[PDB]
Amino acid sequence: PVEYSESLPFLVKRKALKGYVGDVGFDPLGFSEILPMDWLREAELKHCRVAMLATFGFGFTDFWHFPGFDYTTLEAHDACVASGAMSQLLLWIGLLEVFGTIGIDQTLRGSGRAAGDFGFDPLGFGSDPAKMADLQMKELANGRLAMFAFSGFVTQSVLTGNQFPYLFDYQTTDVFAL
Amino acid sequence: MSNDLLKYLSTAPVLLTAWMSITAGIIIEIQRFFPDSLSF
């Protein structure tokens, strides 16, 4: 019996991705063989969550902003670094990430914590174990979509110079013409 | 990190380097904030 990936059915399965959510076998470059799956999945969830927040925040700041912050999305980072409101995020997220590195250290040493589980579930979404696997897969799907979403947001915004849609001026007309 | 890495950081040269770096930093910052103090 030989295992083939469900995403690349011309390759043999890695065999290191067993017992994980979103396990279609997408790992052609074999990072799981070298690095541990716990570290890799913690990184995946961190990128997923930060990218979801980033892609929502980029679009939101394109429309609305607080009275004190009168900057656009592109110059917001520089303006707020000058103002000191990015240090206030790096200090209060760096505290969170100090606790996070303690956590990932513990789970890599085998404390029992999962890859990206912090236990943060106040409202009780998915407290039933049956729904937790489905919600984990949906989390990964939305986050992996949001990574490309934020990448497209930033790149197209800088490339076009247009506010929300990130589309060239000619793309707002005659885009369905024979 | 672990008991093993904590023991390694507790080894003599690592502790001496850390403590002397802390002492040098204290002296340097004291010099920055109270420079050129020839006498009390």
Place this chain on the structure above:
Amino acid sequence: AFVDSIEGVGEETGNKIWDPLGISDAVSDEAVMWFRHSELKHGRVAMLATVGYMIGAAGITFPGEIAKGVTFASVGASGPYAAWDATPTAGKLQILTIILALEWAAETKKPHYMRGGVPGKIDQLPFEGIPGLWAPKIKFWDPLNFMGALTEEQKARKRKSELKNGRLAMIGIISFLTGHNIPGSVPALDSHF
């Protein structure tokens, strides 16, 4: 809690649970408690806001002197939308802090609503049972005890009516604000608001 037991089913959507998008089927029944607490809170705040906004649009205001120099008519001159911005910051903070006390006391009660209590049943006496604090035992909801004359079935029917009117009030208050922000979006609104 469980989407079933809750009473909000009505004739307008047929005598069934109205969950078109299946939000209730992807929750662990712990969050349905939070949703009925928040639904009722939204509906109640929305109907208070709706009657207040209608009062403001009609132009009725208190006799005068909200503050020292400011008058109620002057601070509500430019309709109800700008009235909040016009109100004094001190009195605004007192409204916000009394609401903070109310919504902190409601949360601090032991059964809660998410952890096995009734979602929607705000404690009648929020400020009692607190060591080192004193309040004059005026119960927050139904201070005069209008509900004593009501039996179980009557108050169930009235809870149904509460949910219906709160939902309608949510729609109404959002209609008011959207109609102000976007002229002509709500055609049943005049120049008063």
Place this chain on the structure above:
Amino acid sequence: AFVDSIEGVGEETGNKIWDPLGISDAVSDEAVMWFRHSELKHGRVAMLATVGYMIGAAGITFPGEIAKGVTFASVGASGPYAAWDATPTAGKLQILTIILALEWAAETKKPHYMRGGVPGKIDQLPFEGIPGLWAPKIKFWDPLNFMGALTEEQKARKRKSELKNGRLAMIGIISFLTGHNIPGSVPALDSHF
């Protein structure tokens, strides 16, 4: 699905399968299901398109305004073909959006026309069973349920009629397009086309 089992053979070609090339006999079983679904889709698209093109050439247009400043007569003044460029991009955007929804919903249904589903049978009520989505139960095919008053043999006869009409429809629509592009290629197309 499998060529001998399909209601494709007709009296046009001697009651025999018409595959002058060795396609159907060279391709596997599921390729034929794909081809049959594609044939039905092409036939039906062209069957609507030929009628639409005929109406556009005739100049029969709705009385009203397509947009607040544009008239159906205005977009049809440039002949049947240029009407697609004349119509607002924000309107053909909605047309392509609903077509995207219909195609994706039809493709998402499980049995699948290549994996044990009837080829050419677009599933009725495509927007049902979808989490986080509601749509009224208006059938995509026969919303008034005309098929209910038909028998299975009559329905097979009408399936054959559908196919033989759709093939002629795609012949006709390509005739219209080539008549517009290359002048005089297709006679019977006056200056209105």
Place this chain on the structure above:
Amino acid sequence: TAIKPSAQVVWPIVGQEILNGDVGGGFSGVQITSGVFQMWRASGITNETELYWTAMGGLVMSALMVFAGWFHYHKAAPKLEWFQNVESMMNHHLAGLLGLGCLSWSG
């Protein structure tokens, strides 16, 4: 010809800022004598973004070397038979390291 090359700046802590001498070009620092400026001029670097990006690339290469050193002792260590292939080693170091290094530098 006029500007003295300099790529080190001392902080002002104990009066050591005097070491930031006048090197020309409105810059104060410690004059260097490693020839790296002339090296980069020969290489064709004319701006600082190029220096910054090759520095970042060097950092990436250093991290790659640390990873390779870990990998080739703790994960996949060769054998003495692999090590003793001196003929193949000489072939690869002559044609592969030196030869292609010179070819790439010439390009």
Place this chain on the structure above:
Amino acid sequence: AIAKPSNAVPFLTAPPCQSSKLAGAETGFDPLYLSEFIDLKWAREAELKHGRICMLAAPGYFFQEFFQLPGFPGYSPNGIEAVSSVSPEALAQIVIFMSVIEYNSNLNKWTMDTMFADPKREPGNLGFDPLKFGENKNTRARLEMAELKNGRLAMLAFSGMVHQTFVTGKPVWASLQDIF
């Protein structure tokens, strides 16, 4: 799947302080696991001392702007220029008073072992209770937890007051009322 999660940070293992009998132990808040290294009793003795100093300081800092000791020289409404302006031989006497109290209370017990060498000697139980609230043992736990929480809040509050005064240059109440 942590066997013994921390009651405060449930994605981390239980610290040693969580499985202890001092007051306020259940929270279990110790992300850095400093209870494993530092002696736990010695740190409650420090926690309580710091909290007591800070909850004397915070009301003092907050009310010295409003009130003055009648006739005191060198008074300034903000604590920092107040200590700058006040005569040094008043701060010296305050420090001497504090040092006398500390020395006489901790006589022959100033080290982690010498202090708490006696098993009876409890963390922070210096014996200062003239009114004898501690004889009533029903509310002793309540009072201990309240002292701990108030001391911690006072540490944070005094830190905030001092640093806000550094930011603004104005006393606590003036700086606060110039926000709204």
Place this chain on the structure above:
Amino acid sequence: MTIPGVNAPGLVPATKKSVGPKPEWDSFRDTSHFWSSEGIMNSVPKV
């Protein structure tokens, strides 16, 4: 200070810059924080 909500609007609408011509790659490359000589120097922490 403009406390958003009490003495100021909660959220101000953002400046709609209108859809227009694209910029040039050189234009937004000679101001980037990683591919501009002065952009690199403007990326050092002030502190």
